[PDB]
């Protein structure tokens, strides 16, 4: 087991696999009952002495484009090279692996923007060892502010007790802030259903397919969250210390509920394409009815205007009581009988 | 034997007998020429082109002691690649894709490889192969192929084939990133057909490369005694390259599938637009056609003649009928 070999790359190099290369920041929280210390360091040396520190520490590394920092931390903290590759590898599915010394966790974040129904994916990775939590994230802006302010306020049992509660706090915050985005998407789809029932315009297909792809990505993310929480809860690895088995069982139930919700909502979404097809088919039927009636009334009338509009040397014109109004009345009668037939058949 | 190869034109046999000191090239067509070269202790390379000549490949196979089922599997051309393990020899079959410009199709060539002792054997459907780089390396005394055994040569052949897979993927990438904008911005009559051929090529590549990944994984994990232990990391590297290729193929297929389903969903709106155009134009120009046809009449007595400005008046009323028919629409936004 060692770094995978890539054709384009040189044999040993590790490459970032993302789009965000704008910002670099490190946040280190050494929180404890007696006191806590917070500080931001632009360099990687300051986090190294906390490898074997007894007090729990929480290192937030923002900006993984700097592969130098990540593999320096990995060499210093004993992280295996393949775990480093998967930390850099954003294009990934959430998963966890158990080692002799550390627990590696992969699970993604999603953000949503108004007026643009785009679902992002931020690769945030967690490393649990000794009493340290190592976090690698793509860009500034996180979902863990409530846990940070809870630590700063000293409220909650997470500050008093061990760091496995810190890992649980991070994971619970991530699963919780899935729900802000989920609520936003549910409101968006409800209002969108409102317009599609009101106005079935051209953009509806594009928006519905965008939402369908969004749901596909959410399913491809949520389904790996089980077999992750599954391993954490059932497998009870030694680093858990068995104190937090219900704090993993509840998240198991939460993830199962989310997976069931996405399974239901996929069919809910497909029904929207079904409804749109219904509406467009009905509109096409209306257009057919209008065109058919117009042609049906006005073609025999063109028969009259052509047959009697012929020019011939000996035509039986036979003017009877100035029969030109008589022919006009004949056309009127045939038009009336045709429109009556259409009304009876209920095309119009 | 049962034969299903497409081509019959060419047939040629090539043999490479090279050692750490000297190398020799031989060009011939007789079957018995390669028979003495099998006994050579140094690793040897056999290139046989033309599967339609069943008799010569047969005589070679029974000379080498190859089981007839392997021979008939080689005769089979339309099968998924798969690797066989036997005590006397290891059996491998692969694929050889070729891509072309100005016309977008996939051409696959069946190739099979059998490795026994210090002997390397393969059968080619036509002349020309992707294995030019390894031949050039051997001819000009480069690399470390000569120092190692024949299993390293088998490695070299496989990695040359995966290199040509990468070369194919680059052209596929160009085509997909041009069709992306072609579908999104400027649809055409044949854009749909281009998307279908692209998806066909991609699904064929996926169904071909998954067996290749399985074959390389089996070679790496099983580590058969015939292939030396020291050459297993190279096979693992080729397996990783195949993983790369598979991931690329899956991403490309997803992109093409999205390009398909968006367009396939827009077709109902397309139909509505076309028939709206037809209906509006027909319903505006049929009543006017009748008005002109019936007022342009050839009965003897015309009340139209007596009316002053009759022709301008009928033209004006025809225009206002056209106007009211136009404004009949836009109430449902038909126009």
């Amino acid at each position: 087991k060692r770094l995978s070999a890539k054709k384009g790359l040189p044999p040993g190099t590790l490459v970032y696999t993302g789009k965000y290369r704008e910002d670099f920041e490190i946040e280190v929280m050494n929180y404890s009952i007696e006191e806590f210390r917070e500080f931001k360091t632009t360099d990687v040396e300051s986090v190294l002495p906390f490898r074997d520190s007894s007090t729990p520490t929480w290192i937030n590394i923002t900006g993984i484009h700097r592969t130098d920092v990540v593999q320096r931390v990995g060499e210093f903290f004993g992280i295996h090279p393949l775990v480093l590759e998967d930390i850099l590898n954003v294009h990934q599915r959430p998963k966890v692996e158990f080692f002799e010394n550390y627990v590696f966790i992969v699970l993604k974040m999603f953000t949503y923007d108004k007026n643009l129904h785009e679902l992002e994916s931020e690769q945030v990775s967690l490393i649990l060892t000794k009493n340290c939590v190592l976090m690698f994230q793509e860009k500034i802006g996180d979902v863990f502010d409530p846990v940070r302010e809870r630590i700063r306020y000293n409220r909650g049992i997470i500050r008093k007790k061990r760091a496995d509660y810190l890992l649980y706090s991070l994971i619970d915050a991530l699963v919780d802030d899935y729900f802000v985005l989920l609520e936003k998407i549910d409101d968006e789809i409800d209002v969108l259903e409102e317009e599609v029932l009101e106005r079935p315009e051209k953009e509806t297909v594009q928006r519905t397919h965008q939402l369908k792809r969004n749901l596909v990505e959410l399913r491809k993310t949520i389904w790996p969250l089980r077999e992750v929480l599954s391993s954490l809860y059932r497998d009870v690895p030694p680093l858990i210390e068995k104190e937090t088995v219900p704090y993993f069982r509840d998240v198991y139930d939460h993830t199962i509920q989310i997976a069931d919700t996405v399974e239901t909502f996929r069919d809910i979404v497909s029904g929207l394409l079904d409804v749109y097809l219904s509406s467009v088919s009905n509109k096409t039927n209306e257009v057919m009815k209008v065109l058919t009636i117009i042609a049906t009334i006005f073609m025999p009338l063109t028969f009259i205007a052509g047959i009697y509009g012929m020019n011939f040397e000996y035509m039986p014109e036979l003017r009877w009581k100035w029969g030109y109004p008589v022919v006009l009345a004949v056309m009127g009668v045939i038009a009336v009988i045709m429109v009556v037939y259409f009304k009876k058949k209920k095309w119009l | 034997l049962v034969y299903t190869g497409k081509y019959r034109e060419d047939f040629e046999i090539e043999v490479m007998n090279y050692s750490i000191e000297e190398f020799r090239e031989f060009k011939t067509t007789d079957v018995e020429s390669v028979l003495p070269f099998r006994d050579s202790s140094t690793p040897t390379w056999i290139n046989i082109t033309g599967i339609h000549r069943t008799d010569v490949v047969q005589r070679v196979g029974e000379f080498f002691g190859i089981h007839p089922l392997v021979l008939e599997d080689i005769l089979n051309v339309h099968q998924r690649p798969k690797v066989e393990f036997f005590e006397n020899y290891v059996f491998i079959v692969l694929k050889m894709f070729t891509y072309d410009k100005n016309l977008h199709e996939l051409e696959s060539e069946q190739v099979s490889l059998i490795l026994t002792k210090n002997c390397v054997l393969m059968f080619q459907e036509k002349i020309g192969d992707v294995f030019d780089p390894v031949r050039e390396r051997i001819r000009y005394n480069r690399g470390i192929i000569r120092k190692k055994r024949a299993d390293y040569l088998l490695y070299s052949l496989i990695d040359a084939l995966v290199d040509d897979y990468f070369v194919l993927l680059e052209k596929i990438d160009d085509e997909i990133d041009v069709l992306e904008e072609e579908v999104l911005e400027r649809p055409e009559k044949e854009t749909v057909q281009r998307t279908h051929q692209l998806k066909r090529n991609l699904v064929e590549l996926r169904k071909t490369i998954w067996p290749l990944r399985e074959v390389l994984s089996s070679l790496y994990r099983d580590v058969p005694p015939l292939i030396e232990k020291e050459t297993v990391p190279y096979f693992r590297d080729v397996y990783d390259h195949t993983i790369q290729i598979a991931d690329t193929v899956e991403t490309f297929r997803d992109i093409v599938s999205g390009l398909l389903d968006v367009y396939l969903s827009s077709v109902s709106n397309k139909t509505n637009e076309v028939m709206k155009v037809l209906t509006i134009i027909a319903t505006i120009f049929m009543p006017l056609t009748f008005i002109a046809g019936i007022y342009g009449m050839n009965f003897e007595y015309m009340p139209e003649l007596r009316w002053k400005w009759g022709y301008p008046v009928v033209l004006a009323v025809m225009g206002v009928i056209a106007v009211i028919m136009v404004v009949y629409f836009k109430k449902k936004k038909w126009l």
Epitope: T13, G18, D68 | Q244
Partner: antibody, heavy 122, light 107 residues
Framework: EVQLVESGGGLVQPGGSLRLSCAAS????????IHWVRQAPGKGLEWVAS????????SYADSVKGRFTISADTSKNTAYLQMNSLRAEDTAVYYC???????????????????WGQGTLV | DIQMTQSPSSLSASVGDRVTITCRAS??????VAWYQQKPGKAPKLLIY???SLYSGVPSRFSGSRSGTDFTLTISSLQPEDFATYYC?????????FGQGTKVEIK
């Protein structure tokens, strides 16, 4: 903070040899790739060599293949280009570059020279 | 050896005029195309990498795109700082080659 400095360039008699150098400050050579780009006066940039001290892999331009040797040492955090069998066509203003790989597809990667040197003329 | 042919050889425009610099690849380079600016007597600076991504710190007015093997570096509106030589670089292989260059000078 980051600075990439190259030195050792100067006047050379044609047919001779000249040993270039490159010193890196703020970043470690072991975690990146070091290139060399030369620009003859009034001409376009021409890539000549590339080195990765982590593995020692070397890439050489076919225009100048064999006339150049490139390597780096982790002790002094430096890289250098050694010149052999020089001629008139080798005259240019050589550059030291730092490049990082980026991901575009699972099969293909790319290179981008985001930090360069100040420039030395040979 | 993927030689890159860059057009136009020479061009001139005034401040505020949108321009485009097109690069052509003889062979297929997937998206490994980068753009640099070289002021007279200065080190080149990375602007666009992967043919579509702007390097950090570059003004957002610069933009590049890919059309198959057609790579175009377009400027929303030239500035006094933007009258220089721009280069097209392919990074598909270990052997990496530059373009000829487009020289921009004030009208």
């Amino acid at each position: 903070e980051v600075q990439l400095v190259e030195s050792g360039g100067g006047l050379v008699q044609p047919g001779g040899s000249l040993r270039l150098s490159c010193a890196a400050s703020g970043f470690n050579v072991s975690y990146y790739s070091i290139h060399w780009v030369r620009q003859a006066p009034g001409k376009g940039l021409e890539w000549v060599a590339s080195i990765s001290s982590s593995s020692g892999s070397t890439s050489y331009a076919d225009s100048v293949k064999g006339r150049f040797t490139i390597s780096a040492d982790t002790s002094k955090n430096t890289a250098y280009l050694q010149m052999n069998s020089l001629r008139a066509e080798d005259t240019a203003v050589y550059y030291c570059a730092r490049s990082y790989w980026y991901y575009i597809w699972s099969y293909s990667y790319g290179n981008a020279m985001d930090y360069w040197g100040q420039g030395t003329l040979v | 050896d993927i030689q890159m042919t860059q057009s136009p050889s020479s061009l001139s425009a005034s401040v505020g005029d949108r321009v485009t610099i097109t690069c052509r690849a003889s062979q297929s380079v997937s998206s490994a195309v980068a753009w640099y600016q070289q002021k007279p007597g200065k080190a080149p600076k990375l602007l666009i990498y992967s043919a579509s991504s702007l390097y950090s710190g570059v003004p957002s007015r610069f933009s590049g795109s890919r059309s198959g093997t057609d790579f175009t570096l377009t400027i929303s509106s030239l500035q006094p700082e933007d009258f220089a030589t721009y280069y097209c670089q392919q990074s598909s292989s270990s052997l990496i080659t530059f373009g000829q260059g487009t020289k921009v000078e004030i009208k």
